[PDB]
């Protein structure tokens, strides 16, 4: 089981990222949204970008060995609170093999606030 280290960065241009995203996920007050993004035999990589309005949210990535679902295994990125309300959080990961990626928008730590998740998955 060979797992490539993922790469992660940020971008300042969040207003505009959001703006052309809107042309969007509501994560509940204490819920967890799981976007399942199956691999490609044609692509080699997963690219992702996401941002939120006003409040941070937990982000994490896992790999489900199984052959886009959006719902309410091996670890790529651990699930941590991320300031994707101030900047756009982006990342890549090399396919480990074939399967489905688990993008985890975790708002379970929130008690009163829902989150608006603007995201993108590429190529």
Closest C-alpha among 45, 37, 52, 46 to residue 110: 52
The secondary structure of the chain, three-state, reads CCCCCCEEEEECCHHHHHHHHHCCEEECCCCEEEEEEECCCCCCEEEEEEEECCCCEEEEEEEECCCCEEECCEEEEEEEEECCCCCEEEEEEECCCCCEEEEEEECCCCCCCCEEEEEEEEC
């Amino acid at each position: 089981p060979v797992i490539a280290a993922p790469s992660m960065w940020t971008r300042p241009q969040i207003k505009d990222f959001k703006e052309k995203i809107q042309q969007v996920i509501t994560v509940g007050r204490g819920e967890v949204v799981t976007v399942r993004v199956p691999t490609h035999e044609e692509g080699s990589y997963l690219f992702w970008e996401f941002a939120t309005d006003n409040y941070d949210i937990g982000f994490g990535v896992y790999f489900e060995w199984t052959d886009t679902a959006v719902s309410v295994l091996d670890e790529i990125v651990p699930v941590y609170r991320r300031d994707c309300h101030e900047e756009v959080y982006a990342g890549s990961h090399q396919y480990p093999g074939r399967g489905v990626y688990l993008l985890k928008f975790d708002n379970s730590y929130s008690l009163w606030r829902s989150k608006s998740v603007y995201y993108r998955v590429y190529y």
